């Protein structure tokens, strides 16, 4: 026990194994129906983990996970143990799936003041993990969910943490870590640590991702030379319709010196001001 407030019992879960609607390299995610406390269906996504000794790490997982608490945080539901074996991760369905992959879709019409509050909805829960001295390493439009109500919730997370689409993943041949060289700090890429200073540099390019609808970040620079494109001093340009001063607060989280970037609490602050005003 201990992590009994976090298990699901197995027939008061369905889950939909011929409906895919997601996959990572740790498992396949299914459409599922939940019947929760107030005895009501609700709708859930559930992560299948494939990959007894590790067992206990994923129970002890789940718990830690269970306290973090937040609007634009991803929330765990719970864990279900069955007679299959295969470890079962409870989530809330999210609508729109991820937020790269709705702003992509060309039939969406997000305004410009859509895509800014999304930013925002970032920020805050990214301004939440920080607090809790949580360092997320791999922040990115990929990994934010959008569900029914319009609401971001940071992913990729916890018991959720994996690659999902493996192409802008380096795999370090040595630690086996995930690098997504593309949304990393210019010491990340130098040193492999990761700090909340870094998880500020990459929501610098995921906000250029929103004013970008979606696009790939220096579509034209190689992987080697994004290092020296960055010692280089040179940065992503100013999208067309970015307002300049959310592209002001771009710069900011890519400066050089990790200290002098803001905080996610300074990053809130400023781009709800942004978003109220014009
Ligand atoms: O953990 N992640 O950050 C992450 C990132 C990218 C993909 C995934 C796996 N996909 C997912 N992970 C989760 C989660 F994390 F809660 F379990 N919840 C999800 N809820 C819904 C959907 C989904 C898939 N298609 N759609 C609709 C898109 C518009 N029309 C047809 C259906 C929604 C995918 C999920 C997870």
């Known amino acids: 026990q201990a992590v009994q407030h976090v298990v699901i019992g197995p027939s008061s879960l369905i889950v939909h194994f011929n409906e895919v609607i997601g996959r990572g390299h740790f498992g396949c995610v299914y459409h599922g129906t939940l019947l929760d406390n107030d005895g009501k269906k609700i709708h859930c996504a559930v992560k299948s983990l494939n990959r ?10 789940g718990i830690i996970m269970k306290d973090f608490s937040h609007p634009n945080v991803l929330s765990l539901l719970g864990i279900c143990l069955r007679s299959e074996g295969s470890p079962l991760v409870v989530l809330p369905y999210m609508k729109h799936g991820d937020l790269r992959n709705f702003i992509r879709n060309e039939t969406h019409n997000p305004t410009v003041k859509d895509l800014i509050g999304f930013g925002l909805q970032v920020a805050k829960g990214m301004k939440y993990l920080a607090s809790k001295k949580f360092v997320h390493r791999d922040l990115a439009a990929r990994n934010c969910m959008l569900d029914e109500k319009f609401t971001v919730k940071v992913a990729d997370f916890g018991l959720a943490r994996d690659m999902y689409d493996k192409e802008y993943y380096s795999v370090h041949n040595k630690t086996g870590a995930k690098l997504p060289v593309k949304w990393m700090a210019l010491e990340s890429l130098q040193t492999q640590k990761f700090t ?29 030379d994004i290092t020296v494109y960055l010692l280089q001093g ?23 010196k990790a200290e002098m970037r803001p905080s996610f609490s300074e990053l809130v602050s400023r781009i709800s001001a942004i978003f109220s005003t014009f």
């Open 196 to 224: 909340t200073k870094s998880d500020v540099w990459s929501f610098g390019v995921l906000l250029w991702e929103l004013m970008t609808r979606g696009a790939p970040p220096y579509p034209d620079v190689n992987t080697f």
């Open 234 to 256: 040179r940065r992503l340009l100013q999208p067309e319709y970015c307002p300049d001063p959310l592209y002001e607060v771009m710069l900011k989280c890519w400066h050089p």
């Open 52 to 61: 007894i000794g590790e067992v206990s790490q994923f129970l002890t997982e």
